[PDB]
Design a protein around this ligand. Structure first.
Ligand SMILES: COc1ccc(Nc2ncc3nc(Nc4ccccc4F)n(C4CCCC4)c3n2)cc1
Length: 333
């Protein structure tokens, strides 16, 4: 047989993949690092166990398999291989996704001190990734550091495609318009970038909460109560919940993110600190009509030192049995 099985939970993989070591584990899959003998390099292999098992797993698994082919960008996951060990639709149980092995996820990187050259490099790439997604008609809406990976050479990839409802979820990076069920447009994703950036500086999650109720409170306690023309776009029930919580002035950006947090010894670093704080103050903006756009974020001085036309301006429900077959066929391409 082409496949062999190992306990990791059982991984049943193609024989080219050697010496599996578990490296990750979310609701969606276990991920192993492995050596790929055919390509002569290391890969990450994610097992999606019976993903047609509910609407949630199914939609995500299915959607991300289709979207794979609609993207082609170094800052967005590319698949090396897609496979199932099972040979028939009836036997079908598991999907394995193979990609390049990176060195770390953003959670890990966030915990480090990074200079501005790196910090800004990570961010330029997130924005190039997101720019790519948007040009393909994909607004992500759920960008977060545990789905973002990095290499030692500071290169970065976004691994998932976001949102499009029960099962037996980290929300901290979601935009107000997502937190409050409003219309959104492409700059919804800018907010999540500003949350990841804030976190890189502060080393704490900007807006923690048990659910959207606490989370909103952390938003307003820091950025202050939003403005009139923001309310006008809230559904009347959310509007009135939102027009009735304790108000806040909200702290300026130098209180939010003091010099203390920034590499700021040399003149170069004092200047980069000011510019990083300028971008933060432009991205973490409650009201989307006043939030910076992806293209303006890419022209910001903190980010534009990396700018490269080639990188920036580039390419482009169901029952469980219905999902099993949709996903099977996709895997079979
Ligand atoms: C020790 O802590 C780490 C963390 C990350 C790495 N490096 C690393 N590299 C590639 C990855 N691809 C995925 N997922 C994935 C997504 C879609 C298709 C296929 C996949 F495998 N992950 C998850 C593992 C946990 C973090 C993200 C990956 N992690 C190495 C070590």
């Amino acid at each position: 047989n082409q496949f062999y099985s190992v306990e990791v939970s059982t991984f049943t993989v193609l024989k080219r993949y050697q010496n599996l070591k578990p490296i990750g584990s979310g609701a969606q899959g276990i991920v192993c690092a492995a050596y790929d003998a055919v390509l002569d390099r290391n890969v990450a292999i994610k097992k999606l166990s019976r993903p047609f098992q509910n609407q949630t797993h199914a939609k995500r698994a299915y959607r991300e398999l289709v979207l794979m082919k609609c993207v082609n960008h170094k800052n967005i996951i590319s698949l090396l291989n897609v496979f199932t060990p099972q040979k028939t639709l009836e036997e079908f149980q598991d999907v394995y996704l193979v990609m390049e092995l990176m060195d770390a996820n953003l959670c890990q990187v966030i915990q480090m001190e990074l200079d501005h050259e790196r910090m800004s490099y990570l961010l330029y790439q997130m924005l190039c990734g997101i720019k790519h997604l948007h040009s393909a008609g994909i607004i992500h809406r759920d960008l977060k550091p545990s789905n973002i990976v990095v290499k030692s050479d500071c290169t970065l990839k976004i691994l998932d495609f976001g949102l499009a409802s029960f099962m037996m979820v980290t929300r901290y990076y979601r935009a107000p318009e997502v937190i409050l069920g409003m219309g959104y447009k492409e700059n919804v994703d800018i907010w999540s970038v500003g949350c990841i950036m804030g976190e890189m500086v502060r080393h704490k999650i900007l807006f923690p909460g048990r659910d959207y109720i606490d989370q909103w409170n952390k938003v307003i306690e820091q950025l202050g109560t939003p403005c009139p023309e923001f309310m006008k776009k809230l559904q009347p029930t959310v509007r009135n919940y939102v027009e009735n919580r304790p108000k806040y002035a909200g702290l300026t950006f130098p209180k939010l993110f003091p010099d203390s947090l920034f590499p700021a010894d040399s003149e170069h670093n004092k200047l980069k600190a000011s510019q990083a704080r300028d971008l933060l103050s432009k991205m973490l903006v409650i009201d989307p009509a006043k939030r910076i756009s992806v293209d303006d974020a890419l022209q910001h001085p903190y980010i534009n030192v990396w700018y490269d036309p080639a990188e920036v301006e580039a390419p482009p429900e169901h029952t469980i049995e219905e999902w099993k077959e949709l996903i099977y066929k996709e895997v079979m391409n």
